[PDB]
Amino acid sequence: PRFLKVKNWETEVVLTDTLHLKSTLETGCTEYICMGSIMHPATKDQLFPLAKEFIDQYYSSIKRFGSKAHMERLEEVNKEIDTTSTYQLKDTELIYGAKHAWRNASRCVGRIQWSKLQVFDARDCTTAHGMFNYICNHVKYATNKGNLRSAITIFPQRTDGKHDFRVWNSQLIRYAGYKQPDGSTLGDPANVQFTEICIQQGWKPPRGRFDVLPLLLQANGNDPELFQIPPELVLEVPIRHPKFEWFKDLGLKWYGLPAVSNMLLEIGGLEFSACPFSGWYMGTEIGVRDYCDNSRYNILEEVAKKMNLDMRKTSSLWKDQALVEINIAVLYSFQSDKVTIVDHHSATESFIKHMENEYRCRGGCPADWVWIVPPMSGSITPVFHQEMLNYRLTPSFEYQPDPWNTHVW
Amino acid sequence: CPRFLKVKNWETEVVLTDTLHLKSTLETGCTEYICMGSIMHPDVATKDQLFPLAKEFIDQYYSSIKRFGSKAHMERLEEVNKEIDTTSTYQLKDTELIYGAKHAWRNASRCVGRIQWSKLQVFDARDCTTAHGMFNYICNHVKYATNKGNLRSAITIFPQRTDGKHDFRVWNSQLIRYAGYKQPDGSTLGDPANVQFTEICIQQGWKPPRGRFDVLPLLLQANGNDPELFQIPPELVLEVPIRHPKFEWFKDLGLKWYGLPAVSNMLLEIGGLEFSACPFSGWYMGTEIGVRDYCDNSRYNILEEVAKKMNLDMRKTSSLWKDQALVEINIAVLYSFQSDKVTIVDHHSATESFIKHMENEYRCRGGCPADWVWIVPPMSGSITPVFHQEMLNYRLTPSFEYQPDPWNTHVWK
Ligand code: HEM
Numbered sequence A: 001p002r003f004l005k006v007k008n009w010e011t012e013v014v015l016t017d018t019l020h021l022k023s024t025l026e027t028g029c030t031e032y033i034c035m036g037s038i039m040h041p042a043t044k045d046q047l048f049p050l051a052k053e054f055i056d057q058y059y060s061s062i063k064r065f066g067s068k069a070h071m072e073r074l075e076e077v078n079k080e081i082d083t084t085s086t087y088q089l090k091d092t093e094l095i096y097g098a099k100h101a102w103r104n105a106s107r108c109v110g111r112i113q114w115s116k117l118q119v120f121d122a123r124d125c126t127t128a129h130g131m132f133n134y135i136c137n138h139v140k141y142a143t144n145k146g147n148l149r150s151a152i153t154i155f156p157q158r159t160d161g162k163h164d165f166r167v168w169n170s171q172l173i174r175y176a177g178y179k180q181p182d183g184s185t186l187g188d189p190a191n192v193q194f195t196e197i198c199i200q201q202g203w204k205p206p207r208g209r210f211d212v213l214p215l216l217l218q219a220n221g222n223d224p225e226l227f228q229i230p231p232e233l234v235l236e237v238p239i240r241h242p243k244f245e246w247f248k249d250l251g252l253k254w255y256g257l258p259a260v261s262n263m264l265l266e267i268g269g270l271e272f273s274a275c276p277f278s279g280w281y282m283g284t285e286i287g288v289r290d291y292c293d294n295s296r297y298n299i300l301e302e303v304a305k306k307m308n309l310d311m312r313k314t315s316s317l318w319k320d321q322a323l324v325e326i327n328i329a330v331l332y333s334f335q336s337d338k339v340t341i342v343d344h345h346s347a348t349e350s351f352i353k354h355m356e357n358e359y360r361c362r363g364g365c366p367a368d369w370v371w372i373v374p375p376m377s378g379s380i381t382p383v384f385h386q387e388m389l390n391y392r393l394t395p396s397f398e399y400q401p402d403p404w405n406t407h408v409w
Numbered sequence B: 001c002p003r004f005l006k007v008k009n010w011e012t013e014v015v016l017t018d019t020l021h022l023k024s025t026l027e028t029g030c031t032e033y034i035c036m037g038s039i040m041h042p043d044v045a046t047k048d049q050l051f052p053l054a055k056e057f058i059d060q061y062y063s064s065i066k067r068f069g070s071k072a073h074m075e076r077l078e079e080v081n082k083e084i085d086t087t088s089t090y091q092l093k094d095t096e097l098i099y100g101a102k103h104a105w106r107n108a109s110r111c112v113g114r115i116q117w118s119k120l121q122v123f124d125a126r127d128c129t130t131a132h133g134m135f136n137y138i139c140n141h142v143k144y145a146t147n148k149g150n151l152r153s154a155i156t157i158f159p160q161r162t163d164g165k166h167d168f169r170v171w172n173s174q175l176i177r178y179a180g181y182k183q184p185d186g187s188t189l190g191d192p193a194n195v196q197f198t199e200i201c202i203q204q205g206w207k208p209p210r211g212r213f214d215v216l217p218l219l220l221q222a223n224g225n226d227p228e229l230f231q232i233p234p235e236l237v238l239e240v241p242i243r244h245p246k247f248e249w250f251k252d253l254g255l256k257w258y259g260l261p262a263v264s265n266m267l268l269e270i271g272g273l274e275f276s277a278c279p280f281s282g283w284y285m286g287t288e289i290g291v292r293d294y295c296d297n298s299r300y301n302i303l304e305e306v307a308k309k310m311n312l313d314m315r316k317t318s319s320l321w322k323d324q325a326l327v328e329i330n331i332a333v334l335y336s337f338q339s340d341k342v343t344i345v346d347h348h349s350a351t352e353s354f355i356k357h358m359e360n361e362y363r364c365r366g367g368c369p370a371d372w373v374w375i376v377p378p379m380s381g382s383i384t385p386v387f388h389q390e391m392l393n394y395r396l397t398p399s400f401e402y403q404p405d406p407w408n409t410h411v412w413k
């Protein structure tokens, strides 16, 4: 139980962390073994302290800790957990809970935006058709003709675990991936399995390189149902390069809206298994990971060829040159089409400013260096030289099992 | 802790099982509730602290040579035990010294070059008594390791710590580094990382040339005495001018670096013994020079000058002019070393070798401690295989450790 200091080795700025003392969940590390690079490390009785903990910090946050209203809410919650084995969040608590889950997301470089989140309460939803409707509205609001706005739509919380709401898509908008007879893959290889599942369910594939997948929506534990997002809601950006006029000939494009739909939102012990949320892209997510991962679109080789680079030895850094150029193209393309995007230099600078804000007003900011540092040009961004402390605060976004591994039809 | 910990590669889907972590010796700084993986740095031992550390090491050693529980093993235990009892310390056999040194490297979680761990030339300097002798040992090390460009890894090991008042120390952070000078106008000439050390050298009597690439003198402390200055013979200092295969103007920048990376301020810990002066050396990965030494803001900081000559649009960050320049600089570094026939390894080759090394270690040893934050290169992270590799970080002994800078602790005579 100590105040812990973090140092930036470039600016020499030292911050003092006290916030970590309030954390209650585990990191996955031990005194003897650090696991910082591992990607994936109820009952009434369990429920009430978790609920009380959350109500406590909520009333503490609006400067009414120990108020009439505070105690009454506590009374109300325990008595509701008692009778029904669960409880329902106030609209105000729901919005607070969702913003703080984003605020506490140690892996997210975009958290300077945390309090600017549009929260859609979908807790009255009963069917997959209703889910589809709420999701269309979410996509339309968030896309906003290219001026993207951060949003989250929250479907009903888990009850018995046999009636979960799940969006089976990993994101609301993604491209299909196809196994070919010659053993190669068409489209996005990361979605090959999901695409097969959709096909089995009756989806008719265009079998192109960038086919927008249908929504697969599961309501109240029932079999998931297929829906086609209205295409006019799906903003895409054809990728071209400001100097290489041949770049457009690659036929590359991407969607404007990154909308993660497979995570679990946890607030006060309650579990929201369906909580698709969205902001906007950092260029490297598309330009580095999506396009250049060997297990993804894997385009480095093709680009470097058109750049006429020497590809015989690795020490020519041909991979590195082509990587920067692809990322220039992505940024240039989005900007030219007036679609919100942020480069990794701008994003990491804001994060450092955000950290400083959080230490000042909250006494800390949980941060996962492994995820915060961008997948290219690491050390020429300020976060590389920033020491971070990682710890788990609630409310939070958590991983959950892929739905096809748990569901019985 | 369970006996089995699994790590996955998200790119190849290969899963490895670690059991070696059970032999972890010290804390990492992390707990169940906080991770300190991005923290840089998170008076002698008694008789009674020393017995178990020596035994732990002797057991490991005899186990490694397939003579565990042998008569020679038991007689070695008894000899060490008595020696600690009668003198409060003990002396390693040459074989144990060599074993321990190599294994400190094998156990270094932040080192991406460990596929080479077993090829390490160990120079035994435990007979050294003076700074002049330290200088002699260091010169021979530099000459051997350099090998006219065909670099060979080596370590030179000076006498272990006794009462803590007779430490041997190399005050230099590396055997070969460039001077930095703070100007009265606030600017820095040379390497800003070395300003403090440079000022100490000047104070001890060094006459600086005051240039951009002045090789610093050795500042050497033997047996707890005040440190002494020596100039490394310049013929022993292999350097490489930096030029570029396409950009003719790149030579005009007047950049050069030294061939031999030789870290000299770490402590080597073997079986509870502490070697406070153990300079070691290998060869460079390009990014160490091209990204950190040259492009860090608090270092040589050349991105802007390079970008201006590439005539890049440097008005928006989103032009990625920094990223563009960074690559060309690293191309030039690699090209210049290769052209001059000086050993160097690019980050693609190094990380690819490390993955294979790590897999071999999981199979033959039951694990390989690794610090992802250090193993992943400072540029192009996700296009190297290590980015996608899960790792477990833990501390095995023998090990290399940080120790306080000696000017903070030294009692001047
Ligand atoms: C608004 C602009 C935003 C930007 C620029 C941004 C940026 C990023 C980036 C680059 C990552 C790493 C992604 C990866 O490599 O897969 C990330 C992770 C993450 N973001 Fe943000 N983000 C934004 C908005 C949001 C919002 C609105 C939420 C939730 C309400 C959120 C929650 C998270 C979470 C939970 C992770 C970690 C996911 C995981 O652990 O798998 N982000 N963010």
Ligand code: HEM
Pocket (backbone or CB within 6 Å): B101, B104, B105, B108, B110, B111, B112, B113, B114, B116, B120, B153, B154, B155, B280, B281, B282, B283, B284, B285, B288, B345, B350, B374, B400
């Ligand atoms: C033979 C070629 C070698 C290569 C290519 C190599 C590569 C590297 C690199 C790139 C780093 C990161 C350094 C930084 O970013 O500042 C590192 C760290 C390290 N290396 Fe290796 N190395 C080599 C040889 C050696 C040898 C011979 C030893 C000791 C016997 C050693 C022990 C270490 C240690 C202890 C660290 C971590 C230092 C710290 O925590 O500050 N390396 N190495």
Ligand SMILES: Nc1ccc2ccc(CNc3cccc(F)c3)cc2n1
Pocket (backbone or CB within 6 Å): A170, A171, A258, A260, A261, A262, A278, A279, A280, A281, A282, A285
């Ligand atoms: N630009 C953003 C905004 C929010 C994000 C939230 C989570 C993730 C994590 N990456 C992820 C998650 C699910 C599916 C997928 F393909 C990537 C990335 C984000 N990227």
Ligand SMILES: Nc1ccc2ccc(CNc3cccc(F)c3)cc2n1
Pocket (backbone or CB within 6 Å): B113, B173, B174, B261, B263, B264, B265, B281, B282, B283, B284, B285, B288
């Ligand atoms: N190429 C190599 C070989 C061995 C290394 C050992 C340690 C370090 C760590 N960097 C370092 C350590 C001390 C002083 C210094 F200036 C740099 C880098 C290496 N780099």
Ligand SMILES: C[C@H](O)[C@H](O)[C@H]1CNc2nc(N)[nH]c(=O)c2N1
Pocket (backbone or CB within 6 Å): A036, A037, A038, A039, A370, A371, A372, B010, B387, B388, B389, B390, B391
């Ligand atoms: C092994 C490692 O944990 C894994 O590849 C992580 C590394 N850092 C990352 N960082 C971000 N932002 N996104 C990622 O998917 C990953 N992948």
Ligand SMILES: C[C@H](O)[C@H](O)[C@H]1CNc2nc(N)[nH]c(=O)c2N1
Pocket (backbone or CB within 6 Å): A009, A384, A385, A386, A387, A388, B037, B038, B039, B040, B373, B374, B375
């Ligand atoms: C703050 C952070 O831990 C620090 O900048 C680290 C990051 N990773 C590194 N990795 C290597 N190889 N060398 C370094 O000096 C650092 N610095």
Ligand SMILES: [Zn+2]
Pocket (backbone or CB within 6 Å): A029, A030, A033, A034, A035, A036, B030, B031, B034, B035, B036, B037
């Ligand atoms: Zn840790």
